[PDB]
Write a protein that binds this ligand. Structure first.
Ligand SMILES: CCN(CC)CCNC(=O)c1c(C)[nH]c(/C=C2\C(=O)Nc3ccc(Cl)cc32)c1C
Ligand SMILES: [Mg+2]
Length: 421
């Protein structure tokens, strides 16, 4: 009943899910965020909201996400945005064999130019983090695109490393983005966050205290200009913190963007590889457990659905009935659903009238088997030593940010049984 055809989920953003969709008109792919109106409280009014939307539609900067369309109906708001296929910035950094302060400045000039442009348009990101730094494509010269900013003044519904102390007190302005930028920069220069901890609670307590250091051996050979910039961006008092524009024009950016010898960041890069891979493995594990719970829920639900459609109570359904049941699971357009059911009837199978419980298992086993192969990818990027095992300590960092050795098979079993316990 619209213009877009859903292809798949890309992931999550502030206030809702982001779907890869096909524009039926031109065939072009778009990233579409859906904000379910029930999931938000409006803290302003429709005119104020639509005013920001009009500003968001006008943003045209090389380092800033483009917004094509904003529309709505009774249930949802829809934001139609560009798809970026270069991946997250830090996932690309950790593929490198070398990294210098020049490289760090070339990155930060882009982040700071975009952030300066947002602030000039009175737009605040408010949750700026590396995952919101997307490479536009796989092109060699791909630009960093900042995504997911805006709308914080209009809606109310890891990431703890990047949050300004004033945001924790819910009394902030655009200066909060400068702090997040300063955290990202700190990590670029030494490879670990300035405010650490094993849990969100621990991290945030360090954030609110506001103390950090430039420790040896990491910070020894870092330029005086870089440390000064970090200090200015991580100034505790928002009113005394430098602006995005002043950071952009800071001597460190000017000096290092005019060009890797005297200012290599080899140790930083090694740390970043460990930092990013462990973060991505925690994320993958959370998503896997997330998927396992959803699969068990939808299993029981689809069984109840099919049971109601089973008029004679023989535990069997034909193709058309199966489709009707699949439709009802989504409710808890028709052209796409028939494909998934038919492709699922391949393993199910000829007779035309099948036991729906078998359809249920085969349907969800394909969900569980798909979940593993996504966790596996993250496990492989994490497995920097040749062991193919995760230690109890590494596993402690994982579960301690989630809710003497173990291989991938044992790891999966440890998580699937945790979804039972
Ligand atoms: C479970 C792994 N999953 C892949 C399905 C997460 C990895 N992310 C993506 O593949 C992805 C891609 C290719 N693009 C995006 C997100 C985009 C995107 O491409 N454009 C865009 C604009 C605004 C906002 Cl808020 C978010 C986005 C994402 C999250
Ligand atoms: Mg029947």
């Amino acid at each position: 009943s619209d213009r877009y055809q859903r292809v798949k989920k890309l992931g999550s953003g502030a206030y809702g899910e982001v779907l890869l969709c096909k524009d039926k008109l031109t065939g072009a792919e778009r990233a579409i965020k859906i904000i379910k109106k029930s999931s938000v409280t409006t803290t302003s009014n429709s005119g104020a909201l639509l005013d920001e939307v009009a500003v968001l539609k006008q943003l045209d900067h090389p380092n800033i996400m483009k917004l094509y369309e904003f529309f709505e109906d009774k249930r949802n708001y829809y934001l139609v945005m560009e798809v970026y296929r270069g991946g997250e910035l830090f996932d690309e950094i950790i593929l490198r064999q070398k990294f210098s302060e020049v490289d760090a400045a070339v990155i930060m000039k882009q982040v700071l130019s975009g952030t300066t442009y947002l602030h000039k348009h009175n737009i605040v990101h408010r949750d700026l983090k590396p995952e919101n730094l997307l490479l536009e494509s796989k092109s060699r010269d791909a630009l960093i695109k900042i995504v997911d900013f805006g709308l914080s003044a209009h809606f109310e519904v890891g990431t703890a490393y990047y949050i300004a102390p004033e945001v924790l007190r819910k009394k902030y302005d655009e200066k909060c983005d400068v702090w997040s930028c300063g955290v990202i920069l700190y990590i670029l220069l030494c490879g670990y966050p300035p405010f650490g901890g094993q849990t969100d609670q621990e991290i945030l307590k360090r954030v609110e205290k506001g103390k950090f250091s430039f420790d040896p051996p990491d910070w020894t050979q870092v330029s005086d200009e870089a440390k000064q910039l970090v200090k200015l961006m991580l100034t505790y008092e928002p009113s005394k913190r430098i602006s995005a524009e002043e950071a952009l024009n800071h001597p460190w950016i000017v000096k290092f963007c005019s060009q890797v010898g005297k200012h290599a960041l080899t140790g930083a890069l090694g740390n970043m590889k460990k930092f990013q891979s462990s973060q991505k493995l925690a994320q993958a594990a959370m998503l896997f457990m997330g998927s396992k719970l959803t699969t068990l829920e939808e299993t029981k639900e689809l069984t109840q659905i099919f049971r109601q459609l089973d008029n004679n109570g023989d535990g069997q359904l034909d193709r058309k009935e199966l489709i009707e049941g699949y439709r009802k699971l989504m409710q808890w357009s028709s052209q796409i659903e028939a494909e998934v059911d038919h492709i699922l009837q391949s393993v199910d199978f000829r007779n035309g009238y099948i036991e729906y419980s078998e359809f249920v298992t085969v349907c969800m086993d394909k969900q569980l088997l798909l979940s593993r192969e996504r966790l596996l990818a993250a496990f492989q990027q994490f497995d920097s030593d040749g062991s193919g095992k995760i230690t109890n300590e590494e596993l402690g960092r994982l579960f301690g940010v989630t809710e003497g050795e173990v291989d991938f098979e044992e790891f999966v079993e440890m998580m699937q049984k945790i979804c039972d316990v």
